[PDB]
Amino acid sequence: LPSTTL
Amino acid sequence: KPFFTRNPSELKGKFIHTKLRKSSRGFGFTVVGGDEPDEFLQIKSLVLDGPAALDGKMETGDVIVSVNDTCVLGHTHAQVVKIFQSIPIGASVDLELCRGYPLGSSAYGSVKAYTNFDAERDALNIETAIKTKGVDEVTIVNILTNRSNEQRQDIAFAYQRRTKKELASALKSALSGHLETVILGLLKTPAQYDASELKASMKGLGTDEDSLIEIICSRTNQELQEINRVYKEMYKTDLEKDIISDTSGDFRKLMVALAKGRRAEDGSVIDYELIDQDARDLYDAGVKRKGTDVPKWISIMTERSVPHLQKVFDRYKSYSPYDMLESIRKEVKGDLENAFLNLVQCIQNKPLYFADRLYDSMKGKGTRDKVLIRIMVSRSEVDMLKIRSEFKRKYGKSLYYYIQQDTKGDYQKALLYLCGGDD
Ligand SMILES: [Ca+2]
Ligand SMILES: [Ca+2]
Ligand SMILES: [Ca+2]
Ligand SMILES: [Ca+2]
Ligand SMILES: [Ca+2]
Numbered sequence: 012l013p014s015t016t017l
Numbered sequence: 018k019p020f021f022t023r024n025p026s027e028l029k030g031k032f033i034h035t036k037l038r039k040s041s042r043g044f045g046f047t048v049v050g051g052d053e054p055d056e057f058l059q060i061k062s063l064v065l066d067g068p069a070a071l072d073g074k075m076e077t078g079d080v081i082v083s084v085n086d087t088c089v090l091g092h093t094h095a096q097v098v099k100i101f102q103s104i105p106i107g108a109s110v111d112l113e114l115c116r117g118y119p120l121g122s123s124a125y126g127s128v129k130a131y132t133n134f135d136a137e138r139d140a141l142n143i144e145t146a147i148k149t150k151g152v153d154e155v156t157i158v159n160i161l162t163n164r165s166n167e168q169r170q171d172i173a174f175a176y177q178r179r180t181k182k183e184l185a186s187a188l189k190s191a192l193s194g195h196l197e198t199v200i201l202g203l204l205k206t207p208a209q210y211d212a213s214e215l216k217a218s219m220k221g222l223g224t225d226e227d228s229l230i231e232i233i234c235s236r237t238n239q240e241l242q243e244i245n246r247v248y249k250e251m252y253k254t255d256l257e258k259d260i261i262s263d264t265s266g267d268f269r270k271l272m273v274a275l276a277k278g279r280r281a282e283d284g285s286v287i288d289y290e291l292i293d294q295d296a297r298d299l300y301d302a303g304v305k306r307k308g309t310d311v312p313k314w315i316s317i318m319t320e321r322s323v324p325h326l327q328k329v330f331d332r333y334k335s336y337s338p339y340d341m342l343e344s345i346r347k348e349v350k351g352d353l354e355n356a357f358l359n360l361v362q363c364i365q366n367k368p369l370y371f372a373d374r375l376y377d378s379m380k381g382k383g384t385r386d387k388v389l390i391r392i393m394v395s396r397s398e399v400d401m402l403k404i405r406s407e408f409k410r411k412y413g414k415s416l417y418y419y420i421q422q423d424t425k426g427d428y429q430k431a432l433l434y435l436c437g438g439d440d
Contacts, residue, residue: 012053012060013048013049013050013052013094014047014048014049014061015047015048015094015343016047016064017043017044017045017046017047017098017101017102017133017390
């Protein structure tokens, strides 16, 4: 599970 | 595994080049993938009125090919994220994006995103088909049954902008019969489709409990929150209170309870004590009891997780000489019996449940087109492949074959496209 806000 | 490549010459779709200026809140998009070694990085979402969305080129599911002139095919999520965060406010980033690979589709749907998707071309083609002398149904079916539901929302959007007429209005006027029902059903989002079908099943004292049961018993919590939301948007009443109007007794109780969609989520640990406890409780409440304690059945079957209930029904066979379905058919009757049998089928094997409903809709004189159509529309991007393999295992011939025998013309062709395979 790979999520991040850029 | 999904498709990967380190070489841009081997990427399939189309390429988008964009330049974004870093704002006080970053570039305004989240990235997914890049932990498994051979994994694309794809755009998961965009911040509305943020730099990426305001620019308008980036879209969800786009594969990130390169950043600032450096290929990042096969970069980890951590390496890429670092590249973005190092860019100072007011500096810009160049992004090469590949469009055509899917994000997050079901591996068990029959209908897949079309990879060379051109919403504008399809809108143009469907318009040309609608306005052909004696409507060109083949093209309409050929296109809409081989686009994903969200590509159809894009086609509808482009069609409305090109003609200033809604697509669904133009097709209602151009199509007729069961073909009309399929195509109009396909055009709705899942929540809109299920909401309108729920509405139609409650159109009065002539309530179609079979359809209300099928949707309410088979939809997951997530699916139901969305249904409860757009049902109130669409019909300016809560789904719950329309159920309270057109149902009564213990049947109303069980339908209200399921339709809330707050079943327990899948636990991480299997609870063997509670499994045996529930299995005991179900038996106590039914076969071994005078009459039957319906409230205890509603409570357990609507609240526990689906994997937990699968093990409860197995463990129940230790206690009852009749399994859960046979007990139901002995303890209750009518709409309540129907609802219970439908629910237990969905918990035990949801694809087999739909395969049997499809078989029932065709096996006899004529066709229960309403059920046949709703299942093929609603399940086509969900579990149609499991439904087909369950149906073939049990009935010997494919689902395709039964559709061919029961339906004809463009209606049949639309249903076979939704089915998938050539047989
Ligand atoms: Ca480059
Ligand atoms: Ca025609
Ligand atoms: Ca009894
Ligand atoms: Ca035993
Ligand atoms: Ca039949």
